[PDB]
Structures are given as C-alpha cells and as structure tokens.
C-alpha cells in the first residue's frame, strides 16, 4: 500500500501472508475461519506455498507466527484470467489455524449486503509502499 | 516492500464512476475504491478490503488489480465478495 500507515501489531487478525518456500511474500489472504483462507485467484497459490498467520514484521525474529500448510487450492471455476473477473481462490489448510488474540476470522457479507459509494473502508497489506 | 504491515482507509466508489477511469474493464464481480491519495499496490493482492458493518469488519473486497504504477489518483480494483460469497459458502459446505 502507498501512502498507508503502519498498523497496530495484530489489530487486523485475519490478515495473513502468502509466502513461497523461499520465504518470499507474494500475496495476502484473509482468514475466514481456522480451516480456510480467502485470497485472489490471480495470486497463483500452490500447495508448495505456505500460509503465515499472526505476523506483523516480516523481518522480526521474535514473532509467534503460525506457518500453516495448504492441503488444497479450490479456484473459482468462474475466474476469467483474460479479464481478472471473479478473482477469488479458496485455501483449505492441512493444519487448522489456532485462533487467538492475534489470529481470528473476518466476517463475510450476505450476497444481500449493500455497501454504498462514498463509504470509507480499510485495506491492509505488505504490498510495495512505493512505486 | 515493507517488513511492516500497512493500513489505509479509502472511499468505495460505484462502477459507473469507476468505469469513468477503467472503462469496460470494470465488470460485475469488481468494486473500486481509492483514488483518494492512497492506493493498494503490488504485494497487497489477495488481502482484505474491509467495511465495518453493525460493529464488525466484513470482507467486502479482495485487492485484485489496478494501476501499473499504483497511482494514488486512480481507483484500485477489488473482487466483490458479495457475488462470490455464495460460491464460498457452497465451497465450505461440500469440503
């Protein structure tokens, strides 16, 4: 994120890090529950990829993070790679995430929920802070 | 690429006014936000776009795409979870 601000460590508990076997942060996720991660189709996650829960400082060594494995990748069969439409993938964990003060779930909207233009929400990530 | 977790607030826009920027790229399963002096960027993808509903942060968007240069004056594009939740529900139930 560009022009963001550092967040309070663990104030955004469903926020996870998608990291390759190399330790490289390549995408983000959202813990919808202890057994499932929600991310973007286009992120091309594999079962060789790892799910990092309750981290804050990607470079901190004293963090009690949870490096959870991915049993299966359930890709929206309606993802259009040509247009990046229905850009969503589900992640099914091998090992259940241990919910805590810092590891918890996000809520999902009812297909029925309304969310008006002008409404101020929040995005979070370890995306480039600069172009 | 920040070691530190970032946060940002930004307005949610309509497709109509969003198409104003991205043209016929903005489809039904996409919701725009930003163009407010802040922007999601490379590495942010798959992460959450959350709106507080009735006391609780709800998953309304998934950082998908936008500006090649993560321009703060152009609206970032996100997956619309609401058109996808049915799929997600159906997916959990079976598995």
């Amino acid at each position: 994120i560009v022009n963001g601000e550092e967040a309070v460590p663990g104030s955004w508990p469903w926020q996870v890090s998608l990291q390759d076997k190399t330790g490289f942060h390549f995408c983000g996720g959202s813990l919808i529950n202890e057994n499932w991660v929600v991310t973007a189709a286009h992120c091309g996650v594999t079962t060789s990829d790892v799910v990092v829960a309750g981290e804050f400082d990607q470079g901190s060594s004293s963090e009690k993070i949870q490096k959870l494995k991915i049993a299966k990748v359930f890709k929206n069969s309606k993802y259009n790679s040509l247009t990046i439409n229905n850009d969503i993938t589900l992640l099914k964990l091998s090992t259940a995430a241990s919910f805590s003060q810092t590891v918890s779930a996000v809520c999902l909207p009812s297909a029925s929920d309304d969310f008006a233009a002008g409404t101020t929400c929040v995005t979070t990530g370890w995306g480039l802070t600069r172009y | 690429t920040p070691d530190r977790l970032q946060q940002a607030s930004l307005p949610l826009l309509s497709n109509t006014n969003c198409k104003k920027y991205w043209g016929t790229k903005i489809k039904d399963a996409m919701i725009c936000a930003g163009a407010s002096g802040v922007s999601s960027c490379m590495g942010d993808s798959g992460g959450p776009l959350v709106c507080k509903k009735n006391g609780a942060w709800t998953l309304v968007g998934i950082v998908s795409w936008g500006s090649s240069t993560c321009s703060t004056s152009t609206p970032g594009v996100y997956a619309r979870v609401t058109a996808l939740v049915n799929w997600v529900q159906q997916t959990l139930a079976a598995n």
Binding site: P9, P13, A105, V122 | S9, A56
Partner: peptide, 10 residues
C-alpha cells in the same frame, strides 16, 4: 468474526 482482540487505531 470481525472483532479484533486488539483494536485497529486508524
């Protein structure tokens, strides 16, 4: 769901 144990200070 969606109620952090530790509050975001925006």
């Amino acid at each position: 769901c969606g109620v952090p144990a530790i509050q975001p200070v925006l």
